[PDB]
Each structure stands twice: as structure tokens, then as C-alpha cells.
Amino acid sequence: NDHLMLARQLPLKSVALILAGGRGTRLKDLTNKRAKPAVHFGGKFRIIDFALSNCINSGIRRMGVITQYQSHTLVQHIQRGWSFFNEEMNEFVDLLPAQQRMKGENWYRGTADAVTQNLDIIRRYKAEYVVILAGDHIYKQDYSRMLIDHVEKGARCTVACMPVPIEEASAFGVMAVDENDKIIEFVEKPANPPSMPNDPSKSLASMGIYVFDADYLYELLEEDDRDENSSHDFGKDLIPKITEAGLAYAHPFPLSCVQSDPDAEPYWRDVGTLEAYWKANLDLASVVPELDMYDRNWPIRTYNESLPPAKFVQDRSGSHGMTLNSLVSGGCVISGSVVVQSVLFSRVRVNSFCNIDSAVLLPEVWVGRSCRLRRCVIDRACVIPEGMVIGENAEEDARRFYRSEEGIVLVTREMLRKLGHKQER
Amino acid sequence: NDHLMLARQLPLKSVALILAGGRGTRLKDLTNKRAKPAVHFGGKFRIIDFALSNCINSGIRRMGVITQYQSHTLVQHIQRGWSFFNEEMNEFVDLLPAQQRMKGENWYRGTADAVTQNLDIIRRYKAEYVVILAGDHIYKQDYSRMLIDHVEKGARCTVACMPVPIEEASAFGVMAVDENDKIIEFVEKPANPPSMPNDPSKSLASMGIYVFDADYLYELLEEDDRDENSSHDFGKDLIPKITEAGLAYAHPFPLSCVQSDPDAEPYWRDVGTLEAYWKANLDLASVVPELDMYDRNWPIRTYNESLPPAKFVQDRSGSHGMTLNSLVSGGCVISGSVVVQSVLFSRVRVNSFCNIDSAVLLPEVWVGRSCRLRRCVIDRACVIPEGMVIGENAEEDARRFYRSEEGIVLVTREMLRKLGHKQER
Amino acid sequence: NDHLMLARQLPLKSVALILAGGRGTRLKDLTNKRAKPAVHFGGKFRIIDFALSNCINSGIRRMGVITQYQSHTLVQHIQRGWSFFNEEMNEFVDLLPAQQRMKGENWYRGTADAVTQNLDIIRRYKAEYVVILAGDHIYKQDYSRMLIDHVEKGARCTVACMPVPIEEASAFGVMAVDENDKIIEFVEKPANPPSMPNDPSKSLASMGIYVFDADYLYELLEEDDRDENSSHDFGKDLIPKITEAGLAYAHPFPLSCVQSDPDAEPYWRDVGTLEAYWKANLDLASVVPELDMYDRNWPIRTYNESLPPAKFVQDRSGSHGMTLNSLVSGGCVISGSVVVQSVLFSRVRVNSFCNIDSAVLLPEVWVGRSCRLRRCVIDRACVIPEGMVIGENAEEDARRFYRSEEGIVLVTREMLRKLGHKQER
Amino acid sequence: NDHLMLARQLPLKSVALILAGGRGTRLKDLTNKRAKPAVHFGGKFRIIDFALSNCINSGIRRMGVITQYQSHTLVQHIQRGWSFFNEEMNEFVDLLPAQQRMKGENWYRGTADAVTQNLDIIRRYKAEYVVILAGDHIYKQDYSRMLIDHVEKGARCTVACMPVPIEEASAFGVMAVDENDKIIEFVEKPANPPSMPNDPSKSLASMGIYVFDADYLYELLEEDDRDENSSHDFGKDLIPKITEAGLAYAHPFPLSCVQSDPDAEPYWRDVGTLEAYWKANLDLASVVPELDMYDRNWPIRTYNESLPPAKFVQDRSGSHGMTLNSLVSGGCVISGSVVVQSVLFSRVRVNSFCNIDSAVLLPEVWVGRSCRLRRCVIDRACVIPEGMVIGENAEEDARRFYRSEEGIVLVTREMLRKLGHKQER
């Protein structure tokens, strides 16, 4: 079903649904006061700016952001950086938190029980192709090249699949395909992830990116919402049901990936645990980042906050401040200290004589005089006191703060407030 | 404490808090799928555009909209018509729905238990004067003339009071004042509303508009949040506590009312029941409205939706359509029918041979051919079928639809869908 | 050169250039204080909302509006209704008025000498396909179906051509094509428009819509800007030069026309004279308009001004107001008068006892008591006095106001101010 | 005439008029392709963001920006950073370039002949107090404390005056006042600036900030526009005329100045010559700036451009980059070089082995490998080639580029393009 203009008409006949939804329990306390899509990233972004700017640059300007857990920061972010739309041009970012009445009802029992509470609003959009996006993930995808591959194949559901190492394939949806990219066997979060054919060390995993014939989705959820043994989830209940009827195809991600270096492999990081969050940000600080953010053909839209330039000033002794492979966003004030392999977000104040190495300083952090920081994640608005040392004694950082098994430290206000340090600057 | 520039500095040192909050159980099914602040009004407004445009024109550009019950329409309305702000100029409309975690917690136990869940966010605003607005009400108030009268008197709390007939004074907060506008006796929602001195037929009632010294509010809620017998409400728990310490003054509303005819009385309608909602809209349709909306010195900001002009066309027989004291907003298409004392909102389609009298047609209503409508409220998207008659047989309109004691009919999709009529045009 | 995704990539590689430019000397005094693209139309639109909303809905979000003559209203309109863009997403509406220095230089000698003054700014956009739009015209075109037909054919320039009656073909660019849609003979504004083959009563006319290979445009203007005998115009100088090299193809407009009734003919009105301006607006007032503006698949974006609903009130005698095939936009206040086949724009006040027939009342017009209006165009802010009669005595309307040869009257403030009538309400 | 609420009503009854207007011929080639109000400043600002954010924070939300010379950048900047207004709330930034018709007329003969061409538009605003702002100047003023001092005194015109050294008082309007702040003697740009009484080394100078009774301004310009010997300027023609009638008062700037350190003197820099432009930017780079831009009670609004964080990377040799009292805005990429006392604007790329000292690098500058820069101003988009040396040989920098008498160098593309260096990266 190939036509000259089909590539431009299908995004307009389409509607995206971001399951901002729940959290990552594996992100520890990075999330205790926010949703995982609203975790900061990149010096100025949040994670949901990746699953939203790919809808825009793919022509999909009708989005539906499903928010349940700690969404105040998320909703405020959509309000301030994603509310430039005009509903008359057939474009909008509708927020669909669970509707509360009688004071204790409607709380979204599953991933697919959140698209069923809102199934009277989504019909009104009159959409033929429903993209189902997990927006707690980081990528650069073109969903107007996955929609075609969906329309050429004559598919009803189209799961974006990409291979990953079998070691981490127990956290995603492993499938198995054929010569025509038809899903034969799908199993969600196995304990023994089956390998690919010819690639024993890797498994063909679902990314959480389903494209759906809308006439099939509505008839599949209402045919699923009445099920008493269902767990109400896309992976755990529906995609096996579609697969077992043979109506589920697989769309390889390398085809519909936007990357500035065609020789490279596609970039996917779901920032699962704490360690991959830290490792994902500092990749932007290296010399050749795996993720291009100086790209003008696929830009990422965010809250363009008004901040003054990054100021570097002399310390108390009149000396210089040295920097090496670091990002200093706007608002920062670094008073003559050494910053290495670091990422400083907005409004980070760093007083004199500090040493900062492989750190990520989320916004409004105040580092006090003579602090040493190594392999850490400093949370929002943390007021680090004077002479604090972090990342040199693992036995003394595990009983103060949180310390992952790989050596990454996390600092929060509650962790610092419990040691007596006042966090009200 | 009078200074030359005090009238301009206090709104900037101020923060408004709209308790969009719960519903009006007395509005019947007008509200079953929306909050009372999001009830439509005026052809193009919602009720919360009144409690928000008075903050803007009073200089208060920092608002806090507390939303709990059926807020999807409300939040979408704030997003599309109240998201032109820039957070750098010290201005914003923050939405503060209850934060949900663990799937069944944090549901706002009272009016004053919603400003206590959010008391870690409001401290961050660093506001000295907290205006506490009930935003389910209709008025034109200047809160930079109530803030001064609060600062001149040296008050800690300042309740906007206005007299109302003793008949309807059992639904508001009746107080009693002295020569210096100090509250002596406050009682919330009495069964026998005490009268005023010298005006036995009227009672001095609270409007739900408290101005607070912020250093006193925070210390009053935390001193109240620990109370086990409290009901967590401003009227029912706190304002008596302030009153009994003698720190509560009364600010007359006629002083800080914006009205284009100084000879008139101040305009306050809380659209309590169904009958006062209908009566309040048609007041705009009369020749001399009590509420001026063609006023340019105190304009009301709303979702400026892009709609085509109001089209009037000839009916099936080539005849004319007559109109008398009516409002026809944009999008409407009236095919040669008689419309009298009516208010038609956006996108109301009225086919031929209809007769419409003292009606209010909320948006996207479709009236079919040969319909007669008298003293009714047609809800959103109601698809009235052909030959329907409403408002001529009270015994036949009470057992089909809802009919108030005063004779006002209300029509909803669920009422029409239950009689077999398909509402999917 | 056909590829799966070519239909979506070419608008993003493209840049549109609207020649808002000069005026229509044939519009008489409708234009004396504005550019022809800023002439009002449709109850709420201006003409340049047609040549701009077709770029948006065609994916072309980089526009260049070239303005020279009386552009204050035009520029203010772009500012208030076309400034929702974010320059980071590769989208903008750049205004390119002639750059003034030394107080009397740089005044745009021709249509193609306005794209040559600005040829240092347009290179910076890095565009491969330059659409050249005359934006003083009314249509609904999809320029992402003309760009392909340009890329399939391997063309360098692609002129959108559509047939018109030979009677009015002396005002457009008549061409002649072959079996492959190659322009053979082009002549601009002939005195004897050549006819089509097989259609002696019609001529194949240029619409003023050129698509250009950018590498060819820049090399064609700089190769033309040095010409001393050139008149610096697209039609009169360049398109013959391209044609005579055989690099100019013709793109039929019926292919790339957006119309809701496929059985109909394409809609093109350049509102040439006064009579076609009046006739073009009232077409929207008829029962079946030739131009669909209740279309949601190709909406027109404009200045969504905040106006109250259209109010109809009783006259001084308590009587009704009748309407027949008319458009009443927002702000209007019609006090019980008869309005027929009319178009009332925003904020038109019509006092009692008026009779209005086949009129067009541009905004902020005040009609006084007992006025009769027939076949007229009332300009902006005209304060028609009491008892004025228009359109019943042609000999008495030609020596007061302007009256076309076909019987259309035009009323301006200067025409009314010269008869003594004060126009300062 | 003192009333409780007068401080808040007068800005709303007011209208500001920024004379963005002509250029500074003394800024040399900084301006050759832009107006002086659009000169960059501060890392991210332009100069007209100072004369506009003081209207906003002073409550004056109706501005009129008069633009004549090279306004493409200025108008584009107003469009993208000052077009968040809604005309219904009585707020706007109207652009008033001279209206062009017949191709060579209407070119604004003087400063006060630009408010007379536009005197039919300004009457429509219905403003009582017209602030007349020169917007090519840098300050932090509160015009709602100058308007009162104007209304208390019962003045007709109110000139903001502040003392400056008699050495530079030949470029401003020197006046002389009395005990009641009444102007006695005004003379514009004298050759021998008269001194103050008791301060022989300083002169009481006009800042170009006139507040006017609107009923007097309109009657003063029309009474001046007919004068054949007038030069059509506020200083040179009108203010002497008002002064000689005794209707002109003087408003001291230290009263209505917003400064975070009350012990300091008011900040006024008109960035007259090249040397004061350079000296004015680096003041922001010092440790204690004279101009506070980290102030939240009087923020400056600008084009909040979306730029990535400031990246510092290692040079070709793996080494560190050192910084000392510098501002690095967003977009910059500094590859391991030394930056001192500098100001880098957006998108400045600095390759390896550079040395940059007391420089100002306007946006999109590319510094090549092994460059030494000292006491310079690098203009927009300058592509400095490899091994260039600037600021070490004054005899070799005066015959290449422009070099002021005080030692400041200025680098432009035309200066670099004339030495053969290609500026097309």
C-alpha cells in the first residue's frame, strides 16, 4: 500500500501516547519526589523531552502524556516548555492523570489500564494510528519511518525491536521473529532471556514502542479490561495476545534511528539503575559523545529557561579555575576550583578550593569551600557543607549516603539533613 | 504604615492560591464530569477565569491553583489559556493537584489540608501576603485595594465580607464586626444566620477571600494539621481560631469592587444551585447586564479559541431566522430558527424550525429539526434529536431529565442516551 | 527520483518567500493605508493568512515575508498571530522589509529585486527548494505535492499554472506547455492572451507560485541584478529567461489543491478589483460556500483575538432583529435591525432600525440609527451617521463616495470626513 | 495630588515610546549592519532589553518601539523575545517604522518627527502619561517612581536628570534647576558644559527620559511640526520650548534607580564610543559587578534562546583549559585554551592553544588554533583564521583592523575578508 504522499499524511492521522506513568524503583531516591520521565538529564533536559521531540520532528503533533506518580514537576515542565501549541492547527499535549472523584478511586491499575480509563477522550481525537511510547527512555527515533513500515506490511501492531546483550535482556520484552518480521514468540521479562539465532550473546528486545491500528487497540483493551486474571500491561498481557493471533510485526530500530554518524550503532539508554544514569550524562561530557545534541536536523525541545551566562571567577586567593571535559550550563558560578568529567546543571554555585571529578550536579546545588567530590550524583538543591569529602572512603560513604554496588554515590537533602546539615540556603 | 509606592510593591510580594478544589454538589449533573470552577459561563468563559483575571489586573501574577475533583478539563483549560507566563519575570500559574504515590494516598482531607500538603512548595515562592481565593465564584475584584486595607490596619488575616439576604446566609460564613472592622463573632454555615445591626433582613457574610500574613498562615496550619478533632477547613476551623485571638479584620467588598456604574451594587454570584447558574448567564443576554464584559479597564482572560464567525443561514424553506436579546458565540450555525433570551456557546449547530427561549446551550450542542426548548440548560455535546419538546410539560420533563423545583430543566448525554437517543454525531 | 520518505523531507529542506510586497492599485482606497495582503477577509482573516497557513499545513515552517508598502498593520498582524514559533525547531516567520540607512536608499526596485537585497539572509537558511509565493491571493494549496512533482520531473523551476477565462487572462502570466508539462512559450501580461489548445475560451495562467532550485535562483538573480535593461520582476524578466533555456516546468493546481468536494473546481480569487473583493466575502455567507472554512483538515491560522460573543438586542421599540445568510463575528452588537447577505467583522455596532443588504462591514464600524445599506463596502472604523442612505441612488453615491462601474460602493473615513461627518467615536 | 492607589493606576494610564531610532556614529563599525539598541551586551542581551524590561517591571506594558536605521535584527529580536503579549489585557509592543509609500517618502526627519508621523496611532492608545525613552542606553530604572514625582509636582514635562563629569557633559543635555526641581536653563549639547552649583567638576545632564502629559505632547509637536526652522528633536527644539514657559521639572535618577547595594552610586552607561562598550561588558566579568544581573527583583527579559550547555573539552594534546573572571554563555565550545577577563556570547567555538585576554567575543565567532587575543572586540560570526595575533603590535593592528585611540581593537568580517581570509564557515 505505497503512495507518493503517504509518508506525510500518516503522522497527521496519528496520535502518540506517552506512558510517563510510574517510576523506576531501580533509580533509588533519584525518584522519591518525581517521576522517572522528569529526571534531569543532559545539563538542561528531562527524559520526557526525548519521547516528545521525536513526535514533533516526526510530524506527530498530537501527544497524550499519561502521568500517575509524583507528577507535579513533570506537569509543571510540560506547562512551561510544551505549551506553545494551538489546538486549532490539530496539535496539543494533553495531560491525562487519573480522574479523581469520591476521594479514593480511579488510580490506574496497569500500563494498559491507563489507556482504558482515558478511552473516551482518545476516541474524540479520531486517530487511525496510535503510537504507544514509553517516555522514560532516551533515544532519537523517527516515528514517520516506523509508521510506514507498519503500513507497507499491512500490520495491526508493530513493535520496535532492537538487540541487546543477553545479560540485560531479563528486564525487557524478548521476542523471536521470522523472515518477514512477524513475531512468533513473545515473552515479557523472562528469567532466561532466549538468544537470537546466529547471535548467541544477544537477544531481540522490545523497546516499549508499539504502533497500533486504532480500530484494533480499542477492541483489544475493552476485550482485555473485562479480564479478571489480566495484570493490565502492554507487555505482560496484550502483546502476547496479538502475537498468538499472528497480527504482530517487528520494526527494527536501526532503520528509524536518527544518528549523525551512520557508521555507529543506534543509541538506546533506558537509564535503568543509578549507574547508567551517571554514565549516560558524562557521555555528553566526553570529546566524542555517543549522543549528538549539537544536531540541528533533529533538535530536542525543552524548557528554555532564562539564565545568565556561566560565570567563572577567581577564588579567595586570586587563583584560576581549571576545567577538563565538562559541561557548565547557565546560571552556574564556579569560584576558581577544578572541575573534571563533570556535568553541572543550571544555577550550580561552586565556592572556592573544590575538587569535582566524574560528578553530576543537578540544579541549584551549592558546593561549599574545600569540598572533594568523586563519582557522585548530587540531587536537586543539595547544600553541601564546607570540607565535605565524597568518593574517597567507600566504607564512610555507604553509611552516610547511598552507594551502589559499582561505586556511584548519591546525595540528597534528606541524606544530608539527617547528618545535621542545614539545607535551607 | 502608608508609603507613596506601597500600592505597587505588595502584589509583587504576594501570592494567590485558588481553591478550585472540590465541586458544588448543588449543581447536580452539571458537574459530574468536571469541577465547578470549569463550569462554562458567559458564552466563552469558565468560572475560574474570574478568580484569575482579578489576580492579573491586580498585579498578582503568581497564582496557585489547587485542583482535586475531575480536573482534566480545568487543567487543560489552564494549559491552553493561562500558560503565556515566563517564570523569569516572577510570574506563573502553578497547578497543585495532590501528589500520588503507593497508589491510594494523599487525597486532600479539607480546604486547609490542601494548602498544607503543598506547604513545601509555597515556602519556596517567598511570599509575605497569601491571598486565599475560592475560585468557584463570579466577581470583579481588585485585590490590590484589599491588600492595602490589610496593611493599613496592621492585620494578620483579612476576610472580605459583603452583606447578603438572611434567607441565603445559611450557606456562607456569617460574622459580626465593630467600628474598626474587627471580627468579633464568626460562625460558619449557621442554621439561624444572625442578622446585621440596623439591617434585620441581611447578614454580613464571608466570600471565601482571605488575605493572610504568610508568617501567620504557615504557623497556623502546622498548628492545625496536628489537631485530631479539626475538620481541616478555612471557615470551619481556622477563621474561628484567628477570630478568637482578635487578629481578624473585615474588608468590605464594595470598596475593592470594580464596576462601571458606581450607582450600582456590587455583583456577586456563586452560582450555587442550578437555577442561579441559568439566571446568571441570561443576565448577560439582557439589554443592561449587571455584569459588564465589554469593559476594557478590567478585561477577563480566557482560552481565545479559534472559531469562525457566527453563521446564520436560511432554513429548508428559504425563510429568515429571528433573534431577541441573545448571545451567539463563534462557530455557531443557526439555520433560520427563532432564538430568544438565550446564550449559545461555541460550535452550537441549530437546524431548521427550532424554537429556543430562555435556554443556555453549552458547547458543541446539536439541536435537530423542529425542536422546542424553553427554560433549559443543554449540557456539552448533547445531540438533541428531531422533534424533541422541552419545557412545556413539567410532568413529562421531570421523568425524562432533571427538573429543579423552580422549573429549570437540565439535559445531559447520559439523560438522552438512556431514552435510546444516539449521541455520537 | 522517487523514495519512500521523500514527501516529508523536502518541506524541511525548503523555505517559502511571501511577496507581501506592493499593493493592488485596482483595490482603490481599500488599500491607501495598508498592504493588499493585510486587507481583511472572511470576518476574521487577512489575505496573508492564506499564503501562510498553506506553508504550515504543507510542513514548510520557514517563511520569509517581504513587506514594502504600508506594512504597519501587516507587521503587527504577523507579530500577534504568527509569532508562536521557536527558532530552535527550525521554524520562523522572518520579516524582510528593505533595510534603511543614510535616510533615502534601499527601496526594492522590483518583485525579484526584493529577494536580491535579502540574498545574504536567505543563504543562511541553507535551503534547497525556495517556494516563491505571491501572498496577496486566496487559495488552499498543498505545497508538499507541488514540491514532489518538482522533484520527480527533475525540474529547476516549477510554475503553478491553472486555466482562467481569456477575458481576465490579460492580468496574469499566460504560458503554453507540452505533453511533459514543459513551458514552451511564456509571456507576461499580454494584450491578447493566447488561448489553450482545444479550449479556445480559456488561457493557461501563472498563479505567481514558483518553486525554485535554490542553487539556480541565487545564480539567476545575481546574473539578473547586473542587467541594466531588466525591470527586476519574476514574471517580466526571469521566468522568460528560464523558459528560453527549457528548464521551466508547469505544475497543475488541481493536483495540489485542497478541497472538501472533489467534484468541484479549484478555488482561486486574487481579489483583483473592488467588485471581486465584495463578491468573494459574501460567498462565505451563502448556504454552500465555494470556500470551506469549517474544514479541520486544512485550517487557517490567524490572529485569534479575544472578543465577547455576538450580542443581538432589542431595538428602542422592543422589537426583534432578523438575519438571513449572514456572518456575525465576535464583538458585534446588533440592536434589532435587518441584516441580509452581509458579513460583519469584529466589533461592528449596529444601532436600531437599520437595513443592511449585501454589505461587508469591516471592523469597528458604527452604523447609526435608521440607516439603509445596499451593495457597499464599509471600511475600518467608519462612523456612519444617523439616517444615511447608501446604494439606492447611484447618481448620489458616486459624487459622495466611490462607486465602481458594477455598482459596488466603498465608504471610508476620509470620504465621510469630507462631507462634515465627525469620525471620532 | 497624593491618593492611596495612585502608584498602581498611573502605569496603566501610561504608554512608553522607545526611540530605538538611529545609530551611534561613534560605535564605528559595530553598528554598520544594525541599530545601536540591537548591539549585543552581557553575554545574551541586547541594549533594548534594558529600556523594555524597566517598562514591564514598572507596570508599563504598552510600549512603542520607533525603529528607522538597520532594524532587521532589532525587529526580529522583538518578534522572538517580546511577543508574549496579549492585546486584550491592554499590553503590546508595537513596532512603528516609518510608513513607506510611492517608494521614497516618510523617512523620520528628527527624534520628535518620528513621534509625529505616528501621532494617529498613539492617540488610539488613549494614554494620559507618555514616557519618552531613549533605548540605546543601559540602566535599571523604575518609571512608576518617576511618574508619581511627576504627578505630585503637578508637572507637564519631567526630565530625568543625573550628574556626570563635566568632561563628558558635552554629549548630553545640560540643565540647571532650582529648590523645587524646576528647570531654569536648558541647553542641548553645549561646547562648554556649565557646571553644577557647589560641584564645579560635574554637570546636571539629561538622560533622554522625558515623561509628558499627553494632552501637552500632542499640542507641542503639532505646534512644532509646522515650524520651518526647527530641527525636529526633543533636546534641540522642544525641551527648551517647555523650559522657557516654566512647565518643565527635573526628576533625579538616584530616587527611581533600582540597585541592590544602596551604598553605591546609580549605574548609567550609554556605551557611547567603542571603549565604553568593551569596558561595560567586562564589568560583568569582574568579581563584584557594578551591574547586578543575578537580581530576581528586577529581572531583564530577553530572547531566551535554546542552547546546549557550555562545553569545555581537552585540546589536541590532552591538556586542561584555564579560566579567570570570565563569562561563557551557552553553545560555546572551548577546546582547552586560556580565557581571561573575557565575555563569550552564544555559540563561540574556541579551538586549541588560544590565549584570550580582556576580549569580547560576540556570537558565532570561531577562533582558530594558536590565536592570541588581547583587548579586542570580535564581531558577529567572525571566522578568525589559524595563528592570528591581535593586541600585541598596535602599529600592525591599526592598519589591518580598526583600533581606537585608547587601544581597543575591533574585528569584523569585512576587515578579515579584505585580508583574504574566507569567512564562510
Ligand SMILES: Nc1ncnc2c1ncn2[C@@H]1O[C@H](COP(=O)(O)O)[C@@H](O)[C@H]1O
Ligand atoms: N530549590 C529547591 N529546594 C528544595 N526543593 C526543591 C527546589 N526546587 C525544586 N524542589 C523540589 O525537589 C523535588 C524534585 O523536583 P525536580 O528536581 O524539579 O524534579 C520536588 O519536590 C520539588 O518541589
Ligand SMILES: Nc1ncnc2c1ncn2[C@@H]1O[C@H](COP(=O)(O)O)[C@@H](O)[C@H]1O
Ligand atoms: N464533543 C464531546 N463529546 C462528548 N464529550 C465531550 C466532548 N467534549 C468534551 N467532552 C467531555 O465532556 C466532559 C466535560 O468537559 P467540559 O465540558 O469541557 O468541562 C468531559 O468528560 C469531556 O471529556
Ligand SMILES: Nc1ncnc2c1ncn2[C@@H]1O[C@H](COP(=O)(O)O)[C@@H](O)[C@H]1O
Ligand atoms: N479604530 C480605528 N480608528 C481609526 N483608524 C484605525 C482604527 N483601527 C485601525 N486604524 C487604522 O486604519 C488603517 C488600516 O488598518 P487595518 O484596517 O488594521 O489594516 C491604519 O492606518 C490603522 O492605523
Ligand SMILES: Nc1ncnc2c1ncn2[C@@H]1O[C@H](COP(=O)(O)O)[C@@H](O)[C@H]1O
Ligand atoms: N552567522 C552569521 N554569519 C554572517 N552574518 C550574520 C550571521 N548571523 C547574523 N548575521 C548578520 O550580521 C548582521 C548583524 O546581526 P546581529 O549581530 O544579529 O545584529 C546582520 O546583517 C545579520 O544578518
